[PDB]
Amino acid sequence: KYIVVESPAKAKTIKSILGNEYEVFASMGHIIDLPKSKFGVDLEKDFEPEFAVIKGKEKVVEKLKDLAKKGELLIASDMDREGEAIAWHIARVTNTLGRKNRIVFSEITPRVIREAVKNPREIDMKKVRAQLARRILDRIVGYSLSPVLWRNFKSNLSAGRVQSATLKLVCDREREILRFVPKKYHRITVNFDGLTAEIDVKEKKFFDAETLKEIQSIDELVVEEKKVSVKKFAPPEPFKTSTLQQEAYSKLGFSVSKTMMIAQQLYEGVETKDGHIAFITYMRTDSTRVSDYAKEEARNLITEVFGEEYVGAHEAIRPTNVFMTPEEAGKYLNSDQKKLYELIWKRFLASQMKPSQYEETRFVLRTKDGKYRFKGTVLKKIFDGYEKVWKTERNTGEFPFEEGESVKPVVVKIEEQETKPKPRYTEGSLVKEMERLGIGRPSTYASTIKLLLNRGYIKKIRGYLYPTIVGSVVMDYLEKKYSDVVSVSFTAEMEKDLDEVEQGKKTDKIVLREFYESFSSVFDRNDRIVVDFPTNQKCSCGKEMRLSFGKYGFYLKCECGKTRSVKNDEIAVIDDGKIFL
């Protein structure tokens, strides 16, 4: 009996579980792939893919074949569509496709793996076709456009439409910021007994000087309205991929790629010397679902540690063993691993606890002349519930006053302010937006972001993401020549379609034929352009500068001064055909 995995870390963990019952073999990654050099898809035979053994993996292939002749060869790749395709490759080279030989699991624990190896299944060809269709789409786009982008801008669109749609989100945000016109207004607050209230106005306003003098003179208010109601706050959901990446960015400072690397370590298992042990469930998931087993262990822990009054195919990202507390975990985990584990643990435990309960007092105060009103709220905690674990500070206090009572002293604070544009994306907030719009999936949020940064299409400055000269220019070309095909809308629609292919609810060939019609109608292989944009930069002679591109890359020029060179990753946005540096 042989078990095949992709990584040496997974092999160790599974071997720790099963011992001598099974022989465990690691492929050291992929064995078979589309031709590295050639296009590798036959457009004349309904998008038929061409596969070749990866150079350097031939010995691996031969060993797989040998093992499959010696006993049953179970395949324990990860459960996503990429893993399913790895499993399909192994089955095909070994001539075992159709046998119940594929093992399915969300965690690498004694309990789950021991059961999983006794219940193998047939490879899921729906999942395989979804994956192969993604590979084919990216290959059609990549091999068509990357030469055209090399010819014109010395660049390329490898990670296909998902990369281009995410780049577009960043450029779209940058234009929103560029076009924003701030408005001056006053923030007016009244303060009394640890409470605050804001002036009640229909919209933000810059008040005239005499009005400000009048308002600043207020030293007494009357309670006009007080409404008290019970407010419950729901606990957070257990993590999925997108939410882990967001929160680990905002709470720990981890780039999304670092979060996925640490999370892989904790899912695959780490070497301790109580053997090789796993800490979390699989890290590529769109689900916040929790197993009955996990729910019950969490109830038991909560009941015991906090009290029973605190008790509230893909799975959430959660600890495998809730009794492996963060404190316990530090004997085994490095500092970064322990931070992520702790985050995951608290999120999951909190998700299983009661909503918190507060009394909210909503109040209105007025001047005695009836000219001005101020509104505020205050909360009083009744029950902390999940907040004992998912630490939360709210605006708490006391409102002892009743309707009609005068309040004195009151202190007024008037502050000149200016409206602000939407913030730029951070890695975490870009992932939020990709999920919101159906762009990218658990396997591709982090690698898409990493790729955009690595190619210089976007640049990070103090955690914020900016489009660049080459990012802006490439995006503009794609929009001009491939409008519909590279839209956020068409990219999200394709992702939905691949998910239906996965579920057996649409056909891969229909999806591909339909895409290829759309693409091939607009695709122009010989397109030769001259980069030439007006800009927001001026020469000292007075003339405006224009952006050009030559053998030494991008430069600025005018019809009287000297030419300034510009780097590919200088920050830039194109709006209405003009490049803003």
Place of tokens 């298992």: 269
Report d(CA 146, CA 163) in Å as an integer. Answer: 13
Report d(CA 521, CA 481) in Å as an integer. Answer: 11
Report d(CA 543, CA 563) in Å as an integer. Answer: 12
Cα 56 to chain centroid, rounded: 34
Report d(CA 494, CA 164) in Å as an integer. Answer: 14
Cβ pair 72, 2 in contact under 8 A: yes
Residue 541: burial class (beta carbons within 10 Å; 0-12, 13-18, 19+) = exposed
Phi, psi of 255 (to 5 degrees): -55, 160
Cβ pair 472, 574 in contact under 8 A: yes
DSSP string across 291-350: -HHHHHHHHHHHHHHT-GGGB-----B-BS-TTS-HHHHTTTS-HHHHHHHHHHHHHHHH
What the block records as the tokens of 102 is 């594929």
Q: In angstroms, what is the C-alpha Rg of the chain?
A: 30
Phi, psi of 435 (to 5 degrees): -65, -50
Report d(CA 334, CA 329) in Å as an integer. Answer: 9
What the block records as the tokens of 488 is 């956020």
> Is there a binding annotation on residue 360?
no
Q: Which CATH code fits 179-234+355-421?
A: 2.70.20.10
DSSP string across 109-165: -HHHHHHHTTS-B---HHHHHHHHHHHHHHHHHHHHHHHHHHHHHS---TTHHHHHH
CATH architecture of 1-129: 3-Layer(aba) Sandwich (3.40)
Cβ pair 389, 301 in contact under 8 A: no
Residue 511, H or E segment: helix 508-522
Point out the residues that are catalytic.
282
Strands 221-233 and 544-550: unpaired
> Is there a binding annotation on residue 115?
no
Tell me which residue of 487, 440, 422, 535 sits closest to 174, measured CA to CA.
422
For helices 241-252 and 256-268, the axis angle rounded to 10 degrees is 120
DSSP reduced 3-state for 451: helix
Instruction: Return the bridge partners of 185, or none.
Output: 417
Cβ pair 311, 247 in contact under 8 A: no
Report d(CA 486, CA 100) in Å as an integer. Answer: 40
What the block records as the tokens of 121 is 């299944």
Q: Which CATH code fits 235-354?
A: 1.10.290.10
Report d(CA 488, CA 385) in Å as an integer. Answer: 40
Cβ pair 4, 75 in contact under 8 A: yes
The domain spans of the chain are 1-129, 130-178+422-518, 179-234+355-421, 235-354
Count other Cβ atoms within 10 Å, centred on residue 130. Answer: 26
Instruction: Return the bridge partners of 88, or none.
Output: none
Residue 165: burial class (beta carbons within 10 Å; 0-12, 13-18, 19+) = buried
For helices 125-153 and 469-481, the axis angle rounded to 10 degrees is 110
Report d(CA 150, CA 297) in Å as an integer. Answer: 56
In total, the chain counts a number of residues equal to 581
DSSP reduced 3-state for 416: strand
DSSP reduced 3-state for 105: coil
Cβ pair 231, 358 in contact under 8 A: yes
Tell me which residue of 469, 424, 487 sits closest to 165, measured CA to CA.
487
DSSP reduced 3-state for 90: helix
DSSP reduced 3-state for 188: strand
What is the DSSP secondary structure assignment for residue 280, as one 8-state letter? B
Amino acid making up residue 429: S
- Look at domain 130-178+422-518 and name its CATH class: mainly alpha
Helices (H), 389-507: 427-437, 445-454, 469-481, 488-502
